[PDB]
Amino acid sequence: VTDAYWQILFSVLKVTRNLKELDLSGNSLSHSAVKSLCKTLRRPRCLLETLRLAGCGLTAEDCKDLAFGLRANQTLTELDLSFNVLTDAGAKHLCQRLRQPSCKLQRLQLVSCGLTSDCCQDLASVLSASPSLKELDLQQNNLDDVGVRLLCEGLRHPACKLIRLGLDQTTLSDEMRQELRALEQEKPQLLIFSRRKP
Ligand code: NA
């Protein structure tokens, strides 16, 4: 799918009304496509509350353009970036924006994005300073005890507001698992799920 097409597609979006959910999952988005989309997100009338970019071929550099295009947006509440090789570098660009008080995302999914323990400090930073984040899906990533313990510091922060955290506990030490279960009692309304655990 060619750049000229994308360019015209995102121009059609700016002039259609009460379009509140954009779902491009499955479409490979070139870097030209990703920059165009950053423009439709930076028009002040962007009525978009849900943006789904799962399995689109996004890379770390696309996260920079994405976080930049959302600096002046306070309407978007769902973002799906699952199934893109974003790496901890991509996740870092995103966190710098999610951590802003101006950003009020509620649901973020980063399922299967190639994240490791390296990004958990930037994630915990979001956890302990986000005014509206209620759902963070980190399933199907390679987080170990190093990373999860940094997440727990963000979870225990009295400002943290998460109610659902998708997190695979497959390779965590039993010490780690116990820390996670103790946190069910310090934060009674946080649910820690995993479709990968029976
Ligand atoms: Na925030």
Give the Å distance between the CA of 95 and the centre of ligand 1. Answer: 9
CA distance 72 to 78: 16
CA distance 175 to 93: 31
- Beta-carbon contacts of 126 under 8 Å, excluding residues fewer than 6 positions away, are 95, 98, 99, 133, 154
DSSP 118: G
Integer angstrom CA distances of residue 132 from 76, 129, 188: 11, 9, 18
Domain at 99, CATH number: 3.80.10.10
Kind and range of the H or E element at 97?
helix 87-98
Q: Say what the resolution is, in angstroms.
A: 2.5
**Centroid of chain to Cα 7:** 25
Domain range for 128: 1-198
Backbone angles phi, psi at 147, to 5 degrees: -70, -45
CA distance 173 to 133: 27
Backbone angles phi, psi at 85, to 5 degrees: -80, 75
Give the three-class secondary structure for 167. coil
Q: Domain count for the chain, please give it.
A: 1
Give the Å distance between the CA of 27 and the centre of ligand 1. Answer: 29
Number of Cβ within 10 Å of residue 175's Cβ equals 10
CA distance 118 to 96: 14
Give the Å distance between the CA of 106 and the centre of ligand 1. Answer: 9
Give the Å distance between the CA of 46 and the centre of ligand 1. Answer: 19
Give the Å distance between the CA of 174 and the centre of ligand 1. Answer: 32
DSSP character string of 30-78: -HHHHHHHHHHHHSTT---SEEE-TTS---HHHHHHHHHHTTT-----E
CA distance 103 to 130: 7
Give the Å distance between the CA of 135 and the centre of ligand 1. Answer: 13
Give the Å distance between the CA of 158 and the centre of ligand 1. Answer: 14
